[PDB]
Amino acid sequence: SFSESALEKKLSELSNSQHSVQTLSLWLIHHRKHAGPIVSVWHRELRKAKSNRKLTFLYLANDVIQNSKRKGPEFTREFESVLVDAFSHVAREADEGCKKPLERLLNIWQERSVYGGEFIQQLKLSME
Amino acid sequence: FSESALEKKLSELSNSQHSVQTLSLWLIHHRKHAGPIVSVWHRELRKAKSNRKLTFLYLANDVIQNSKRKGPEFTREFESVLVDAFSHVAREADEGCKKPLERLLNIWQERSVYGGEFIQQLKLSMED
Protein backbone atom coordinates (compact mmCIF):
# COMPACT_ATOMS: atom_id res chain seq x y z
CA SER A 1 0.00 0.00 0.00
CA PHE A 2 1.24 3.48 -0.90
CA SER A 3 2.23 6.16 1.58
CA GLU A 4 4.73 8.99 1.57
CA SER A 5 6.29 7.51 4.67
CA ALA A 6 6.85 4.23 2.83
CA LEU A 7 8.25 6.03 -0.24
CA GLU A 8 10.65 8.17 1.79
CA LYS A 9 11.91 5.03 3.51
CA LYS A 10 12.36 3.08 0.27
CA LEU A 11 14.20 6.09 -1.19
CA SER A 12 16.48 6.21 1.87
CA GLU A 13 17.29 2.52 1.25
CA LEU A 14 18.00 2.83 -2.49
CA SER A 15 21.38 1.28 -3.39
CA ASN A 16 23.44 2.02 -6.51
CA SER A 17 22.47 -1.36 -7.96
CA GLN A 18 20.24 -2.10 -10.91
CA HIS A 19 18.30 -4.47 -8.68
CA SER A 20 17.60 -1.77 -6.07
CA VAL A 21 16.63 0.66 -8.84
CA GLN A 22 14.29 -1.72 -10.71
CA THR A 23 12.65 -3.07 -7.56
CA LEU A 24 11.69 0.44 -6.43
CA SER A 25 10.68 1.51 -9.95
CA LEU A 26 8.19 -1.42 -10.05
CA TRP A 27 6.49 -0.35 -6.80
CA LEU A 28 6.23 3.23 -8.06
CA ILE A 29 4.72 2.12 -11.40
CA HIS A 30 2.30 -0.03 -9.44
CA HIS A 31 1.45 3.10 -7.46
CA ARG A 32 1.41 5.39 -10.49
CA LYS A 33 -1.93 6.93 -9.55
CA HIS A 34 0.27 8.81 -7.06
CA ALA A 35 2.75 10.07 -9.69
CA GLY A 36 2.50 13.71 -8.58
CA PRO A 37 3.33 13.09 -4.90
CA ILE A 38 5.88 10.46 -5.91
CA VAL A 39 7.85 12.84 -8.12
CA SER A 40 7.65 15.61 -5.50
CA VAL A 41 8.98 13.33 -2.75
CA TRP A 42 11.69 12.04 -5.14
CA HIS A 43 12.86 15.59 -5.88
CA ARG A 44 12.89 16.53 -2.18
CA GLU A 45 14.80 13.43 -1.12
CA LEU A 46 17.24 13.91 -4.05
CA ARG A 47 18.24 17.38 -2.92
CA LYS A 48 18.54 16.07 0.66
CA ALA A 49 20.48 12.90 -0.17
CA LYS A 50 24.19 12.46 0.51
CA SER A 51 26.31 13.56 -2.44
CA ASN A 52 27.40 10.05 -3.44
CA ARG A 53 23.78 8.89 -3.75
CA LYS A 54 22.18 11.61 -5.88
CA LEU A 55 23.16 10.17 -9.28
CA THR A 56 21.25 6.96 -8.47
CA PHE A 57 18.06 9.04 -8.13
CA LEU A 58 18.34 10.04 -11.79
CA TYR A 59 18.73 6.40 -12.87
CA LEU A 60 15.62 5.55 -10.80
CA ALA A 61 13.76 8.27 -12.69
CA ASN A 62 15.11 6.74 -15.93
CA ASP A 63 13.72 3.29 -15.14
CA VAL A 64 10.38 4.68 -13.98
CA ILE A 65 9.87 6.94 -16.97
CA GLN A 66 10.69 4.39 -19.67
CA ASN A 67 8.80 1.54 -18.01
CA SER A 68 5.69 3.63 -17.26
CA LYS A 69 5.20 4.84 -20.87
CA ARG A 70 3.19 1.73 -21.76
CA LYS A 71 0.94 2.47 -18.78
CA GLY A 72 0.33 6.21 -19.07
CA PRO A 73 2.09 9.56 -19.62
CA GLU A 74 1.56 10.78 -16.03
CA PHE A 75 5.11 9.96 -14.91
CA THR A 76 6.75 11.43 -18.00
CA ARG A 77 4.70 14.59 -17.49
CA GLU A 78 5.32 14.78 -13.75
CA PHE A 79 9.06 14.21 -14.01
CA GLU A 80 9.31 16.84 -16.78
CA SER A 81 8.42 19.52 -14.19
CA VAL A 82 11.53 18.81 -12.04
CA LEU A 83 14.22 17.27 -14.27
CA VAL A 84 16.01 20.49 -15.26
CA ASP A 85 16.45 21.38 -11.55
CA ALA A 86 17.42 17.80 -10.77
CA PHE A 87 20.01 17.62 -13.57
CA SER A 88 21.36 21.05 -12.75
CA HIS A 89 21.68 20.03 -9.08
CA VAL A 90 23.46 16.74 -9.76
CA ALA A 91 25.76 18.38 -12.33
CA ARG A 92 26.69 21.00 -9.72
CA GLU A 93 27.51 18.27 -7.19
CA ALA A 94 29.57 16.47 -9.87
CA ASP A 95 31.65 19.54 -10.75
CA GLU A 96 32.42 19.77 -7.03
CA GLY A 97 32.92 16.06 -6.38
CA CYS A 98 34.93 14.51 -9.23
CA LYS A 99 38.27 16.16 -8.29
CA LYS A 100 37.56 16.45 -4.54
CA PRO A 101 39.99 13.61 -3.68
CA LEU A 102 42.71 15.51 -5.58
CA GLU A 103 41.88 18.76 -3.83
CA ARG A 104 41.95 16.98 -0.48
CA LEU A 105 45.27 15.34 -1.34
CA LEU A 106 46.87 18.75 -1.92
CA ASN A 107 45.44 20.08 1.38
CA ILE A 108 47.17 17.18 3.12
CA TRP A 109 50.47 18.07 1.39
CA GLN A 110 49.92 21.69 2.36
CA GLU A 111 49.14 20.83 6.01
CA ARG A 112 52.07 18.46 6.36
CA SER A 113 54.49 20.69 4.41
CA VAL A 114 55.17 17.80 2.04
CA TYR A 115 56.16 20.46 -0.49
CA GLY A 116 56.63 24.22 -0.22
CA GLY A 117 53.75 26.66 -0.65
CA GLU A 118 54.75 27.89 -4.11
CA PHE A 119 54.81 24.35 -5.49
CA ILE A 120 51.47 23.42 -3.90
CA GLN A 121 49.97 26.45 -5.66
CA GLN A 122 51.37 25.21 -8.98
CA LEU A 123 49.76 21.82 -8.30
CA LYS A 124 46.44 23.45 -7.47
CA LEU A 125 46.65 25.64 -10.57
CA SER A 126 47.49 22.57 -12.66
CA MET A 127 44.00 21.14 -11.98
CA GLU A 128 41.94 24.06 -13.28
CA PHE B 1 64.59 -4.26 -8.46
CA SER B 2 63.48 -4.21 -12.09
CA GLU B 3 61.49 -1.75 -14.17
CA SER B 4 59.77 -4.90 -15.38
CA ALA B 5 59.01 -6.01 -11.80
CA LEU B 6 57.76 -2.49 -10.95
CA GLU B 7 55.46 -2.45 -14.02
CA LYS B 8 53.95 -5.70 -12.73
CA LYS B 9 53.38 -4.56 -9.14
CA LEU B 10 51.90 -1.42 -10.64
CA SER B 11 49.36 -3.36 -12.71
CA GLU B 12 48.49 -5.36 -9.59
CA LEU B 13 48.19 -2.27 -7.39
CA SER B 14 44.75 -1.77 -5.75
CA ASN B 15 43.07 0.92 -3.60
CA SER B 16 43.47 -0.99 -0.32
CA GLN B 17 45.63 0.40 2.49
CA HIS B 18 47.61 -2.84 2.31
CA SER B 19 48.30 -2.76 -1.43
CA VAL B 20 49.47 0.89 -1.50
CA GLN B 21 51.63 0.74 1.65
CA THR B 22 53.20 -2.61 0.66
CA LEU B 23 54.30 -1.32 -2.74
CA SER B 24 55.47 1.94 -1.11
CA LEU B 25 57.73 -0.03 1.25
CA TRP B 26 59.34 -1.93 -1.64
CA LEU B 27 60.02 1.29 -3.56
CA ILE B 28 61.50 2.93 -0.46
CA HIS B 29 63.69 -0.16 -0.12
CA HIS B 30 64.80 0.46 -3.72
CA ARG B 31 65.18 4.22 -3.31
CA LYS B 32 68.59 4.16 -5.00
CA HIS B 33 66.54 3.72 -8.18
CA ALA B 34 64.26 6.70 -7.43
CA GLY B 35 64.83 8.28 -10.84
CA PRO B 36 63.72 5.19 -12.80
CA ILE B 37 60.86 4.51 -10.36
CA VAL B 38 59.21 7.88 -10.89
CA SER B 39 59.70 7.59 -14.66
CA VAL B 40 58.03 4.17 -14.77
CA TRP B 41 55.37 5.31 -12.27
CA HIS B 42 54.54 8.30 -14.48
CA ARG B 43 54.40 6.15 -17.67
CA GLU B 44 52.02 3.68 -16.04
CA LEU B 45 49.81 6.38 -14.46
CA ARG B 46 49.05 7.75 -17.92
CA LYS B 47 48.22 4.27 -19.28
CA ALA B 48 46.11 3.32 -16.25
CA LYS B 49 42.31 3.31 -16.45
CA SER B 50 40.68 6.50 -15.23
CA ASN B 51 39.36 5.14 -11.92
CA ARG B 52 42.81 3.80 -11.00
CA LYS B 53 44.70 7.04 -11.44
CA LEU B 54 43.90 8.35 -7.93
CA THR B 55 45.48 5.20 -6.58
CA PHE B 56 48.72 6.01 -8.41
CA LEU B 57 48.75 9.44 -6.76
CA TYR B 58 48.15 7.78 -3.42
CA LEU B 59 51.16 5.53 -3.95
CA ALA B 60 53.22 8.67 -4.75
CA ASN B 61 51.83 10.28 -1.58
CA ASP B 62 52.85 7.32 0.54
CA VAL B 63 56.34 6.98 -1.00
CA ILE B 64 56.99 10.72 -0.72
CA GLN B 65 55.79 11.08 2.91
CA ASN B 66 57.49 7.90 4.12
CA SER B 67 60.75 8.38 2.17
CA LYS B 68 61.48 11.68 3.90
CA ARG B 69 63.12 10.08 6.93
CA LYS B 70 65.54 8.32 4.53
CA GLY B 71 66.51 11.17 2.22
CA PRO B 72 65.15 13.89 -0.10
CA GLU B 73 65.54 11.89 -3.33
CA PHE B 74 61.93 10.71 -3.72
CA THR B 75 60.65 14.22 -2.90
CA ARG B 76 62.93 15.76 -5.53
CA GLU B 77 62.27 13.08 -8.14
CA PHE B 78 58.49 13.32 -7.82
CA GLU B 79 58.62 17.14 -7.76
CA SER B 80 59.81 17.10 -11.39
CA VAL B 81 56.70 15.25 -12.64
CA LEU B 82 53.80 16.03 -10.30
CA VAL B 83 52.53 19.16 -12.04
CA ASP B 84 52.20 17.07 -15.24
CA ALA B 85 50.75 14.18 -13.22
CA PHE B 86 47.96 16.16 -11.46
CA SER B 87 47.19 18.01 -14.67
CA HIS B 88 46.64 14.72 -16.47
CA VAL B 89 44.67 13.13 -13.65
CA ALA B 90 42.53 16.27 -13.24
CA ARG B 91 41.91 16.46 -17.01
CA GLU B 92 40.70 12.85 -17.17
CA ALA B 93 38.46 13.42 -14.12
CA ASP B 94 37.00 16.44 -15.89
CA GLU B 95 36.44 14.48 -19.12
CA GLY B 96 34.63 11.60 -17.43
CA CYS B 97 32.84 13.49 -14.66
CA LYS B 98 29.38 13.98 -16.19
CA LYS B 99 29.35 11.07 -18.69
CA PRO B 100 26.64 9.29 -16.69
CA LEU B 101 24.38 12.36 -17.02
CA GLU B 102 25.20 12.72 -20.71
CA ARG B 103 24.38 9.06 -21.31
CA LEU B 104 20.94 9.43 -19.68
CA LEU B 105 20.21 12.41 -21.96
CA ASN B 106 21.55 10.48 -24.97
CA ILE B 107 19.24 7.56 -24.23
CA TRP B 108 16.21 9.86 -23.81
CA GLN B 109 16.89 11.75 -27.05
CA GLU B 110 17.26 8.60 -29.11
CA ARG B 111 14.29 6.71 -27.65
CA SER B 112 12.11 9.85 -27.79
CA VAL B 113 11.48 9.85 -24.04
CA TYR B 114 11.38 13.62 -24.37
CA GLY B 115 11.72 15.97 -27.33
CA GLY B 116 14.81 17.83 -28.48
CA GLU B 117 13.59 21.12 -26.99
CA PHE B 118 13.44 19.73 -23.46
CA ILE B 119 16.40 17.44 -24.14
CA GLN B 120 18.50 20.44 -25.14
CA GLN B 121 17.17 22.21 -22.02
CA LEU B 122 18.49 19.39 -19.81
CA LYS B 123 21.73 19.54 -21.84
CA LEU B 124 22.16 23.20 -20.97
CA SER B 125 21.44 22.50 -17.31
CA MET B 126 24.62 20.42 -17.09
CA GLU B 127 26.59 23.62 -17.73
CA ASP B 128 24.34 25.50 -15.29
UniProtKB/Swiss-Prot annotation, chain B:
Listed result of changing R111A: Complete loss of binding to POLR2A CTD in vivo
Localization terms from the record: Nucleus
SS bond list: none
Domain of life: Eukaryota
CID domain segment(s): 1-128
Tissues showing expression: Preferentially expressed in a range of tumor tissues including colon, lung, liver, breast, prostate, stomach, uterine endometrium and cervical cancers with higher levels in tumors than in adjacent non-tumor tissue (at protein level).
Function comment: Interacts with phosphorylated C-terminal heptapeptide repeat domain (CTD) of the largest RNA polymerase II subunit POLR2A, and participates in dephosphorylation of the CTD by RPAP2. Transcriptional regulator which enhances expression of CCND1. Promotes binding of RNA polymerase II to the CCDN1 promoter and to the termination region before the poly-A site but decreases its binding after the poly-A site. Prevents RNA polymerase II from reading through the 3' end termination site and may allow it to be recruited back to the promoter through promotion of the formation of a chromatin loop.
Family statement drawn from the similarity comment of this UniProt entry: Belongs to the UPF0400 (RTT103) family.
Subunit structure: Homodimer. May form a heterodimer with RPRD1A. Associates with RPAP2. Associates with the RNA polymerase II complex.
Name by which UniProt lists this protein: Regulation of nuclear pre-mRNA domain-containing protein 1B
